[PDB]
Design a binder for these strands. Structure first.
Lengths: 231, 229
DNA sequence: AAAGACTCTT
DNA sequence: AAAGACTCTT
């Protein structure tokens, strides 16, 4: 399937590749820095052509956002527009890890807010997650010598709702937080939500601050009880 | 000086993709986070070359989310550190986000590599740029499409280009003047001094509600001082 | 505008 | 944890 093929390609490319730095048209190479801000960018650029190849193979068109719009890549067959696939690349570093899974006050609450296509046209939302362990200009003949700012990159592909957690991933920027677990748990899909509907309902009614949440719910246990009693 | 040399190097120093150890090149994306990341990596070598030529050591933050991108200083003079931050924006009159107003400018030790008081200068290296799903090999360098048509750069003291309107809301950033590249280069700001720049931002209220009863721009701030703050 | 969209630390 | 640190658009 598109998913299995996508997973295998990312898994493969990541085994046989290491990004060294940026290159100028005159062939000078510039090394990478340690800021995850740098790596997120590097992993997004590194993923682009792979997603595109696998997609094209399966008859899917790919569209990128325009600024501030989810998702990184929108896939769909020309014949079935109403059945889009949204893929977003998330990065974190290292042990348990956690990801910020996007805002909970935009498209999940307002169909056309900050999203490339209306939210209801997407049938799937995948997360490609990259996990890396944190660790002069160069010429082409030196690519092997350039030091990298990371080690042991792991990648996984999973449904957003499946790895979504019950605690916010950011305060002021109101992001959904992922489960806090090991990489294996992400691959296996050992989350907390029972369905994508439960995921969407929980995050659609989550209050922005703990003060507001004290009266409603702060975690999945409390949410289910609140549901049991009539909301 | 270190400043004139840095400025000359910057003007002197076209990135077209990321390169793997195995020689495969991946093109640049249009994404905003992309170019700022690119311009910061491009600047590092320049900064380090010039600094070292002047006896300065360069340090980058170890913890993320700590200002500034580059801290320069001579081990002999530790209270004369210089801060350099790279800022990026695009064109198709520009404007920059110049950092937060609720962190280190209000709290000496907050989100900064060294206490605010040890820095005698805060420079901004501003990059302005006018805005392929395949890989390439080293031999095709000349054919890789770039996502920007031109780039301009400048070095200027932070206070000189600072404006009176916030650069962002929820992320409480200082807004720069809203002018042409030329003005930034020359330093055609609004604040009389760095001391006034600092006072305005240390007392700036977060929301328009809190602000309307105090000050929302330079004139209102000057009146607020007359009134006895 | 002014406010709120788009990974990490303490 | 929850809250608040780190360029663009509505």
């Amino acid at each position: 399937s598109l998913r299995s093929d996508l997973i295998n390609a990312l898994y493969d490319e990541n085994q046989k590749y290491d990004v060294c730095g940026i290159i100028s048209a005159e062939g000078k190479i510039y090394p990478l820095g340690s800021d995850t801000k740098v790596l997120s960018t590097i992993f997004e650029l590194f993923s682009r052509p792979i997603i595109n190849k696998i997609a094209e193979k399966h008859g899917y068109i790919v569209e990128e956002p325009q600024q501030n719009h989810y998702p990184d890549f929108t896939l769909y067959k020309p014949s079935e527009p109403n059945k889009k696939i949204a893929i977003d690349i998330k990065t974190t570093y290292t042990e348990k890890i956690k990801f910020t899974l996007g805002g909970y006050t935009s498209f999940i609450r307002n169909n056309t807010k900050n999203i490339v296509y209306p939210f209801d046209q997407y049938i799937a939302h995948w997360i490609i997650g990259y996990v890396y362990t944190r660790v002069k200009t160069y010429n082409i003949n030196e690519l092997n010598e350039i030091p990298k700012p990371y080690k042991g990159v792991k990648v996984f592909l999973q449904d957003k709702w499946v790895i979504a957690g019950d605690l916010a991933g950011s305060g002021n920027t109101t992001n959904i937080g992922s489960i806090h677990a090991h990489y294996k748990d992400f691959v296996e899909g050992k989350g907390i939500f029972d369905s994508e509907d439960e995921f969407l309902d929980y995050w659609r009614n989550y209050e922005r601050t703990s003060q507001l949440r004290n009266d409603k719910y702060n975690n999945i246990s409390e949410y289910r009880n609140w549901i049991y009693r009539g909301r």
